[PDB]
């Protein structure tokens, strides 16, 4: 185990992990004298991050190649754990123009060097029960958050006559990274902002009036309009939300592109009855979608960097990317794939909602995001629980963010 072997560390939702196994099989079939060992990780992005930093900080060659959340990729680049890809691109005359340059420019490069490639580009999406909206006299998905609430309540009241577990709108509110993504969408769709850059350094503006107003709406979805379940802030993460909607217990769902792949699975009660649209916005502002996704990189400590690069090229290849979009519903890191007839047949929204993905709002791209996120999670979740007001929460978060930015 030191020649033509490579351990690929990857996680995700259960179905994605199973899909990766198939990808690895296809890779070894195309490259006969090579071995790729799967190092399975969890779904939770923080657990995936920890699994990786623990191996890397110990200069272990074990994980040779792996996926990194666009949210904390900057941390790995800054720490210097990634092997620059420039040399490998150069040697194979590899064409980089086939990837969305915006995400690359934003998160994959530093000091003129490339350290990773986008496997998929996630953006927040609104999933809705087309059949239920039609049933209750609504011809189109909601454009504003207030319209979503209106539809959600009428559908909820009607469905509860026979369904007491039905909720008009499910989303991620647990105290973890996913909550920051949901939060970002409400903030920017109300004209708010988490902060901006000054003199090359990010400066926090967590407690702007627009932000507080946005957080208040989130709190109201649970405690005032009551279209989102109480466990939204205690247990709801990607999968629990995705499962609840697929079970048929929700009219609306906010989730990432992967939910589509599952919702459209023949084992899905909602198959053929799900629509996808941009998330709503508050009047006078534009719809927002948080930028997410996973990028592939090579460990600086790998003893099989050449093989790792071969695997990277395969994962970023047209056919493999096409399979991700058609089977898993992922929005590819490689351009034009969304337009492939096979992809439009199974995941038409990748083409139709092109603007959603291209305009995804990035969380603060800074080496110390993990620590910043922890601050936002605590106060935002506390506010959702009703433990403190939106105002007190963002003001408190503002204080700690400033201290954190002070290095």
Ligand X SMILES: OC[C@H]1O[C@H](O[C@H]2O[C@H](CO)[C@@H](O)[C@H](O)[C@H]2O)[C@H](O)[C@@H](O)[C@@H]1O
Give the interface with Cl ion as residue ranges (CB under 5 A). Answer: 223, 230, 326, 342
Cα–Cα distance between 143 and 148 in angstroms, integer?
7
Enumerate residues 212-241 that contact Pt ion by CB under 5 A: 223
Residue 228 C-beta: closest distance to Cl ion, Å: 9
Site residues, ligand X (CB under 6 A): 11-13, 16, 43, 45, 69-71, 122, 177-178, 181, 238, 256, 258, 292-293
Closer Cβ to ligand X, 124 or 390, answer by number: 124
Q: In terms of CB distance, is 66 or 233 closer to Cl ion?
A: 233
Q: Give the one entry of ligand X, Pt ion, Cl ion, none that residue 243 binds, where binding means its C-beta sits below a cut-off of 5 to 8 angstroms depending on kind.
A: Pt ion
Closest distance to ligand X from the beta carbon of 140 (Å)? 27
> In terms of CB distance, is 69 or 159 closer to ligand X?
69
With CB under 5 A as the contact rule, the residue among 247, 335, 339, 387 that binds Pt ion is 247
> Nearer to ligand X by C-beta: 159 or 177?
177
Give the DSSP per-residue string, 329-388: ---BSBTTGGGSHHHHHH-THHHHTHHHHHTPBPPP--TTHHHHHHHHHHHHHHHHHTSS
Q: Which option in Cl ion, ligand X, Pt ion, none does residue 70 bind, with CB closer than 5 to 8 A by kind?
A: ligand X
Please identify which residue in 308, 326, 337, 397 interacts with Pt ion, judged by CB under 5 A: 326
DSSP state, residue 117: E
Q: Which of 380, 371, 366, 13 is nearest to 181 (CA)?
A: 380
Nearer to ligand X, 48 or 281 (CB): 48
Q: Where are the beta strands (DSSP E) in 53-180?
A: 63-69, 109-110, 113-114, 117-123, 125-129, 167-170
Q: Which residue has the tokens 């898993």?
A: 328
Q: How near is the Cβ of 378 to Cl ion at its closest, in Å?
A: 19
Q: Which is nearer to ligand X, 264 or 304 (CB)?
A: 264
Q: How many whole angstroms separate alpha carbon 253 and alpha carbon 13?
A: 17
Beta strands in 280-332, from DSSP E residues, in sequence order: 291-298
What are the beta bridge partners of residue 291? 123
Name the residue among 39, 250, 264, 45 with its Cα closest to residue 165.
250
What is the number of H-type helices and E-type strands within the chain?
A: 18, 13
Asked if residues 177 and 45 have their Cβ atoms less than 8 Å apart, the reply is yes
Least distance between ligand X and beta carbon 256 (Å):
5
Instruction: Give kind and range of the element (H or E) at residue 404.
Output: helix 390-405
Output 247 or 371, the one with its CB closest to Pt ion. 247
| Of the residues 70, 187, 244, 308, which one makes contact with Pt ion according to CB under 5 A | 244
Instruction: Tell me the CA end-to-end span of the chain in Å, nearest whole number.
Output: 42
The verdict on 25 binding Pt ion (CB under 5 A) reads no
CB of 354 to ligand X, least distance (A): 18
Binding positions for Pt ion, 328-367, rule CB under 5 A: 342
Q: Which residues bind Pt ion (CB under 5 A)?
A: 223, 243-244, 247, 326, 342
């Amino acid at each position: 185990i030191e020649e033509g072997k490579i351990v690929f560390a990857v996680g995700g939702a259960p179905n994605e992990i199973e899909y990766w196994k198939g990808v690895i099989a296809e890779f070894e079939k195309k490259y006969p004298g090579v071995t790729v060992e799967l190092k399975r990780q969890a779904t939770d992005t923080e657990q995936r991050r920890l699994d990786l930093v623990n191996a890397l900080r110990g200069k272990s060659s074990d994980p040779d190649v792996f996926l990194m959340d666009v949210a904390w990729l900057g941390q790995f680049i800054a720490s210097g754990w990634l092997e620059p890809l420039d040399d490998y691109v150069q040697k194979d005359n590899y064409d980089l123009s086939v990837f969305f340059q915006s995400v690359i420019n934003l998160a994959d490069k530093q000091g003129g060097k490339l350290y990773a490639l986008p496997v998929y580009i996630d953006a927040g999406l609104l999933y809705y029960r087309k059949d239920l909206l039609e049933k209750y006299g609504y011809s189109k998905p909601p454009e504003t958050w207030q319209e979503l609430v209106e539809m959600a309540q009428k559908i909820q009241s009607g469905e509860r006559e026979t369904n007491p577990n039905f909720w008009g709108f499910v989303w991620q509110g647990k105290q973890y990274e996913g909550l920051v993504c949901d939060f970002v969408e409400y903030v920017y769709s109300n004209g708010g902002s988490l902060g901006e850059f000054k003199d090359g350094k990010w400066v926090p503006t967590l407690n702007k009036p627009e932000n507080v107003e946005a957080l208040q709406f989130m709190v109201d979805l649970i405690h005032k309009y009551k279209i989102s379940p109480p466990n939204t802030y205690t247990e709801m993460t990607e999968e629990p939300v995705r499962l609840m909607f697929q079970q048929g217990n929700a009219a609306f769902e906010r989730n990432w592109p992967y939910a589509w792949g599952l919702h459209n699975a023949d084992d899905s009660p909602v198959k053929g009855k799900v629509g996808v649209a941009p998330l709503p916005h508050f009047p006078g502002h534009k719809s927002a979608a948080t930028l997410g996704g996973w990028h592939i990189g090579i460990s600086k400590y790998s003893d099989n960097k050449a093989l790792a690069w071969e695997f990277v090229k395969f994962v970023e290849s047209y056919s493999v990317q096409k399979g991700f979009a058609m089977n898993l519903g992922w929005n590819p890191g490689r351009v034009d794939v969304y337009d492939d007839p096979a992809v439009v047949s199974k995941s038409p929204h990748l083409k139709e909602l092109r603007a959603v993905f291209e305009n995804a709002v990035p969380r603060p791209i800074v080496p110390y995001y993990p620590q910043l996120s922890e601050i936002i999670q605590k106060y935002v979740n506390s506010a959702l629980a009703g433990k403190i007001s939106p105002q007190e929460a963002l003001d408190k978060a503002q204080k700690e963010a400033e201290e954190l930015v002070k290095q």
